[PDB]
Ligand binder design. Structure first.
Ligand SMILES: NC(=O)C1=CN([C@@H]2O[C@H](COP(=O)(O)OP(=O)(O)OC[C@H]3O[C@@H](n4cnc5c(N)ncnc54)[C@H](OP(=O)(O)O)[C@@H]3O)[C@@H](O)[C@H]2O)C=CC1
Ligand SMILES: O=C(O)c1cnn(-c2ccccc2)c1OCCCCc1c[nH]c2ccccc12
Length: 159
């Protein structure tokens, strides 16, 4: 099982400036719940976006994608290709825009949090992967985040 998990603005933006222009604790909690115990696969940019206190995400197998054969990520695996990271039974691809696109051929689950923020796409923004017609998905109800923003989860599924 290879799944993808991300939050996005309505416009499709998922990152900007190497970080994320929002923070919803309710999605962090949901993120932790869905990934806990399993493999988490990230690109080197996303690993760098992670504070050193938080790194590696506890209780999970942290794997970094990087083309530098000597890149050190203390507490995680650094692999040169994505097939290396798919040896565990449940693997979740946690970003960013590059690795989401790499993993999409392997994926049958997309947990998408949609953040009600009007975030027009600027150059250099990272983006959610386009989901074609092979993906079926249940659209959740709008919820209120204590950060002021509304959000809703999409759960996309394919065979
Ligand atoms: N809203 C959300 O839920 C999420 C948002 N984000 C944000 O989105 C952005 C993510 O960054 P993004 O620009 O997409 O970069 P990535 O996080 O996808 O990392 C790209 C890096 O991964 C390595 N890489 C890319 N392709 C390959 C490949 N085929 N093989 C081996 N290594 C590869 C490279 O490492 P190297 O260059 O060292 O060789 C590359 O620099 C950040 O802003 C982050 O804050 C991150 C995840 C979740
Ligand atoms: O999971 C944990 O236990 C944990 C512990 N600390 N942080 C954390 C908290 C604030 C800032 C950075 C990390 C955790 O998760 C991140 C949840 C934030 C939203 C998020 C959604 N997708 C992501 C992909 C990559 C990084 C962050 C996210």
């Amino acid at each position: 099982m290879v799944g993808l998990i991300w939050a996005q603005a309505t416009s499709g933006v998922i990152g900007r400036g190497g970080d994320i222009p929002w923070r919803l604790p309710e999605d962090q909690a949901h993120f932790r719940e869905i990934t806990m115990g399993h493999t988490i696969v990230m690109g080197r940019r996303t690993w760098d976006s992670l504070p050193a206190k938080v790194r590696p995400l506890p209780g999970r197998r942290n794997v970094v994608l990087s083309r530098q054969a000597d890149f050190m990520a203390s507490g995680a695996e650094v692999v040169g290709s994505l097939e290396e990271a798919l040896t565990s039974p449940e693997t979740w691809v946690i970003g960013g825009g590059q690795v989401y696109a790499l993993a999409l051929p392997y994926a049958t689950r997309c947990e998408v949090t949609e953040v009600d923020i009007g975030l027009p796409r600027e150059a250099g923004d990272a983006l959610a992967p386009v989901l074609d017609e092979t993906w079926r998905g249940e659209t959740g109800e709008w919820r209120f985040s204590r950060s002021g923003l509304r959000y809703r989860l999409y759960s996309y599924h394919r065979s």
